[PDB]
């Protein structure tokens, strides 16, 4: 009846923009899979989206996902803009390209693959997993090996 999985995520960036990284943990009945990658020039918002995107796309079957993130930006996108974006060809109020459309569309595609249960956490603090994701994100940010291809300007 759909395996239940828990995903923890964290995006971290040394600047705005600047080197950044994402950290994600996927827990299933005890065991977990780690995901991390560093980029030379990106933003915290994009890394936060990427963390979720990567964890979700790694699932090979429909699952019930409890997705935890401390990103206020992802929370706002998910809870207040995603709906209208799709129902509008991904354009703002006065018909204009939405910021980070490349990652939001990719996330939306992965979210539609599962039964999602978002968990809006307030920072790492007392969440072992998210704290762990932050560590991985920072570590990747300090040793970036990829370019955030979908990032240009508009900041
Ligand atoms: Mn964080």
């Amino acid at each position: 009846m759909l395996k239940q999985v828990e995903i923890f995520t964290d995006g971290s960036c040394l600047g705005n923009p600047g080197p950044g990284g994402y950290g994600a943990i996927l827990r299933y009945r005890g065991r977990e899979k780690t995901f991390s990658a560093g980029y030379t020039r990106t933003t915290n918002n994009r890394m936060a989206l990427m963390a979720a995107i990567v964890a979700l796309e790694a699932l090979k079957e429909h699952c019930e996902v409890i997705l935890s993130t401390d990103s206020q930006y992802v929370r706002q996108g998910i809870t207040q803009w995603i709906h209208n974006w799709k129902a509008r060809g991904w354009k703002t109020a006065d018909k204009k390209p939405v910021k980070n459309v490349d990652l939001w569309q990719r996330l939306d595609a992965a979210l539609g693959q599962h039964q999602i249960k978002w968990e809006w956490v307030k920072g790492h603090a007392g969440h072992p997993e998210n704290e762990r994701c932050n560590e991985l994100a920072r570590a990747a940010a300090m040793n970036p090996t990829l370019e955030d291809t979908g990032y240009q300007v508009e900041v």
Side-chain angles (χ1 to χ4, degrees), residues 3-153:
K3 60 156 73 171
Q4 183 188 69
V5 183
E6 297 183 277
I7 292 179
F8 296 97
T9 67
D10 191 274
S12 182
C13 190
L14 292 166
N16 189 189
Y22 69 72
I25 299 174
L26 184 162
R27 263 224 308 271
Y28 173 51
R29 200 71 181 188
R31 49 264 323 304
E32 70 184 33
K33 296 183 182 179
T34 296
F35 292 103
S36 182
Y39 299 75
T40 48
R41 193 185 199 185
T42 186
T43 71
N44 172 50
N45 289 166
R46 289 180 63 80
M47 290 299 93
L49 284 171
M50 201 63 91
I53 287 158
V54 173
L56 288 176
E57 296 180 338
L59 299 172
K60 313 292 285 299
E61 57 186 281
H62 298 96
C63 304
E64 175 188 60
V65 179
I66 299 174
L67 209 182
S68 169
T69 180
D70 70 338
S71 168
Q72 163 83 293
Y73 174 72
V74 173
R75 183 178 185 171
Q76 270 186 287
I78 294 299
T79 68
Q80 31 179 296
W81 310 319
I82 195 65
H83 181 54
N84 309 313
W85 283 338
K86 288 186 60 55
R88 187 172 301 175
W90 297 91
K91 297 184 179 67
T92 61
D94 53 52
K95 321 304 175 61
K96 275 178 158 52
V98 302
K99 224 299 186 60
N100 296 320
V101 62
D102 70 307
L103 295 188
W104 279 113
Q105 289 178 170
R106 189 171 164 184
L107 175 62
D108 176 68
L111 291 173
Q113 279 277 206
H114 316 283
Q115 216 59 57
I116 303 295
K117 305 182 61 183
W118 290 94
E119 185 198 334
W120 314 118
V121 306
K122 316 85 169 297
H124 336 306
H127 308 62
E129 301 74 15
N130 304 81
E131 241 304 306
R132 228 121 66 62
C133 288
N134 181 66
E135 298 193 299
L136 289 172
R138 293 193 166 198
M142 293 270 75
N143 186 199
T145 64
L146 299 171
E147 166 172 51
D148 179 356
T149 281
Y151 181 83
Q152 336 75 181
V153 191

